[PDB]
Amino acid sequence: SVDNAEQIAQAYSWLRAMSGGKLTQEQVTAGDSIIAMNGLKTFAQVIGYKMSVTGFRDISENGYKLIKSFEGFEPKAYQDTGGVWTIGYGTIKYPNGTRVKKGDMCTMAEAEEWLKNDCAWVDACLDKYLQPTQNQFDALASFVYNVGETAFSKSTMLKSLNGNFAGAANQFDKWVYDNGKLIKGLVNRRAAEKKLFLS
Amino acid sequence: SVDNAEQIAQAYSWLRAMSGGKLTQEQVTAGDSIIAMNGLKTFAQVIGYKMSVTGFRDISENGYKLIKSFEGFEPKAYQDTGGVWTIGYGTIKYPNGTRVKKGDMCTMAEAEEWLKNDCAWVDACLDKYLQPTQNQFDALASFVYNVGETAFSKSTMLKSLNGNFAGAANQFDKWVYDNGKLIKGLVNRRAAEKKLFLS
């Protein structure tokens, strides 16, 4: 409703998961055009992003640790696989809505700030599809932020959540395929989310 | 590149799968605004829809039969769960880009025409992620049209495709959950795609 530049980075990282893990410069250029032209709400609405209050738990420092681990610190802006300029821990939009560009530089304490804004939709999403999971949804937050809202809502992994927590823990492992192929980073990532799923 | 009104219905049914099985009037109103404002290409680009030539096989009449079976014939326009006016076999945009509206009426031969346009992205999608599967991808086409491009590209079901065709056939069954819940229509649907997966 009330537009805020904070939410641009959020819609985009939500879109990034719905687009299978990456954005193309085509998407970003299209969506920035929409945002300039129609307003942030039209952008969020057409993709299905319902901007979010959830007094359930927040991503703890350790949750951010593994999230950080998989994104990979980049202290200078670099052109990603899709062609979008990117910096820090996967950040393409600063909290003030401006774009990462060629030349930008950061520190880890800067980059983790932008990452918290990047991720700030994950707990709201986790809330609507889930029992309070104390504070070991830090593995789930890393999971939904990687895999996306629609993916989580259709998952057999969600079935065993709401209460076989042991099959959920084994479900992390199955999500390692991309494009029919097995991805070492994913099982590596899946492993660390499965393992962190066990306090 | 060259815009065509045919492709509006296609981007939307592709978006419908990426949005977890339904569109809200919010999405449609947003996307029609974008299309009027920025052009069809900006709409397709921001959602990740790469409009498609694939001389591999086409959805046979029987493939359309089960697709028809699950959509459900509606000879008069009706407001869907999401609030979008809908007619025939799940059609919300006619091939000329105009919207289904309150008052519209059809026949089965009309509705199956619009359905073929609705689905005309499925075979291109099937081509890029897949071996020629003779003409028993009529179960896969019904699968991808329901479940969406990103879903198919991350599926363990795709892993066994490219060649354990027997685990694929059993994979259909697992996709029955939505929102953590089991859906009778889905296993019903999954069943008929699993079974049709065996000539």
Numbering used by the authors:
A (entry chain A), B (entry chain A): 2 to 53, 56 to 133, 136 to 167, 169 to 205
From the reporting publication:
As a proof-of-concept, five peptidoglycan hydrolases from the Acinetobacter baumannii proteome (PHAb7-PHAb11) were identified using PlyF307 lysin-derived peptide as a template.
We solved the crystal structures of PHAb8, PHAb10, and PHAb11 and unveiled that hyper-thermostable PHAb10 underwent a unique folding-refolding thermodynamic scheme mediated by a dimer-monomer transition, while thermosensitive PHAb8 formed a monomer. Results showed that PHAb8 was a monomer, while PHAb10 and PHAb11 formed an asymmetric dimer. Interestingly, PHAb8 showed high topological similarity to monomeric PHAb10 and PHAb11, with the typical catalytic triad (Glu-Asp-Thr) located at the coil region. Our results showed that PHAb8, PHAb10, and PHAb11 were denatured with transition temperatures of 41.4°C, 53.7°C, and 59.9°C, respectively.
